[PDB]
Symmetry: C2
Subunit: 116 residues, 2 copies
């Protein structure tokens, strides 16, 4: 059926990629992980596929820093896979304020998380 | 089950990616495409997922050139998607020489190929 091949390989791609992501979340969301570099423990609520260790976050005074730097400075850890998604853990009284959010959101790297 | 999360997301990834590729070939291999930039027509025998327009090929005297340059110089075409696979078309009397190959192999970009 007349149509650019790449464009077809793009549609097909999406349909598959999406099934892949929906399969990791359906397997991770709900379970408990251990950040081994600090013996802590969190329960995954979501996976953020649109973020990556190259992205940055904003500390208290506004200063921004990429997850890559944050981990080598605070933990002396060199993140290998700079293309992994971020694991999301949400606290217990996060939204509350009818609309606006309170507590932020905890972001872990799959590379440093281990299952149980 | 105790195991690094990323490593799990890697296995799961493969199993999916592979299904994706096996789905494009199972849909392209056998069909006829039209390189619109020259009204030619070929029958896809394979898709080479391990190659990309950034790879190069060797002309008659050995001189190497990337598909990206080859297309802007010979056709004045600027390839957008530098991450697409290469479509493979094999001729009719290619191997012959009990072992060694004769005629090479024709490589088309999905971005420039259209189906029928």
């Amino acid at each position: 059926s007349n149509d650019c091949v790449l464009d077809v390989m793009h549609a097909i791609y999406q349909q598959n990629k999406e099934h892949f992501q929906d399969e990791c979340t359906k397997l991770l969301v709900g379970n408990i992980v251990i950040t081994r570099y600090n013996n802590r423990t969190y329960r995954i609520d979501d996976v953020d596929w649109n973020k990556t260790p190259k992205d940055s976050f904003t500390m208290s005074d506004g200063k921004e820093i990429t997850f890559l730097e944050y981990y080598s400075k605070n933990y002396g850890i060199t993140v290998k896979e700079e293309d992994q998604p971020l694991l999301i853990h949400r606290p217990s009284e996060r939204q509350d304020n009818h609309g606006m959010l309170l507590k932020g959101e905890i972001l872990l790297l799959p590379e440093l998380s281990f299952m149980t």
